[PDB]
Amino acid sequence: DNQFYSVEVGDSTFTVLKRYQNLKPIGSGAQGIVCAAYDAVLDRNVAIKKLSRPFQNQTHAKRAYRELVLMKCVNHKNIISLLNVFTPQKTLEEFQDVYLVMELMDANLCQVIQMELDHERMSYLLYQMLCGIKHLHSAGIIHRDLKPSNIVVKSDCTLKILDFGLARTPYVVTRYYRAPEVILGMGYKENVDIWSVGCIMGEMVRHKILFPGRDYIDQWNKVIEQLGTPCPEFMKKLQPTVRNYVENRPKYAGLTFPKLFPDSLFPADSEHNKLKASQARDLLSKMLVIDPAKRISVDDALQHPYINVWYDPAEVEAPPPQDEREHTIEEWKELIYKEVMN
């Protein structure tokens, strides 16, 4: 009469509570071993992420913990919420897998990005990312790794960020949206995520990853090629070694934003589209700014004409979410186990 049951999903076996049924592979949108499921209890589809032996290595355990802990703690419309967490195992000993249940959206930004550019939709989404991002920031959380695959949205355009990005600190690492200061290993501040949002917004318009690269090298060139070489102030912030490589790169004036994001990528009928196209590029221009010292901030971005319309004080001025010590496998198992056991 066990309350759990195992269901083979893809090459994974999800052993979840009976309430969760019709488990199915989310697909490419799966940020981990995640699958779609129907929560009989809540009569709501949910995404069930499975973490097999999270405590195995260090980094992972730490991240999985931080994630789980934060996800529980945060409660914001644009940050994936934790519908429920559990493990089939009944003891720390037996403990192996952790299943995070969270609302299931209908698509992630990758998908959305491929949709015909709509200003209300793009505007709303962006507003929503800034929001989430703002909430994260207001908690000392600076994502630094915002990407279309880790942001999902419902049909009603509700946008939610899946993970709490990097923690104060490259295989299968979508670096296409990492801010320059990150890529180039410089320090960073909140506006480091504005870059990520710029890349996304631009991509929504261009429909092509703005800065594709087989690695960071190509990326940087694609960056500079389009946004032009950064100012010496930026260079100077570069580690001696890096700065050397970067500064010795081919000098690019960089394409203007009107050219980076032509009018043909935007609606042309209404003057509304004409203005919005202009605002879009404007915003983009303020986000897709190599030098974070010169890059627009979340509040300013939020107050930008393009996002302006959705601005809701209550949402934006929502109070921050209610550690960083290393551990050992055996120690992380407990921490995580307890957290799962609440």
Ligand SMILES: Oc1ccc(-c2cnc3ccc4ccncc4c3c2)cc1
């Ligand atoms: O085609 C797609 C593309 C993406 C999703 C989708 C929707 N919601 C969610 C919600 C939480 C998630 C947590 C971790 N990984 C993926 C998703 C997820 C994925 C669903 C269908």
Ligand SMILES: [Cl-]
């Ligand atoms: Cl610059």
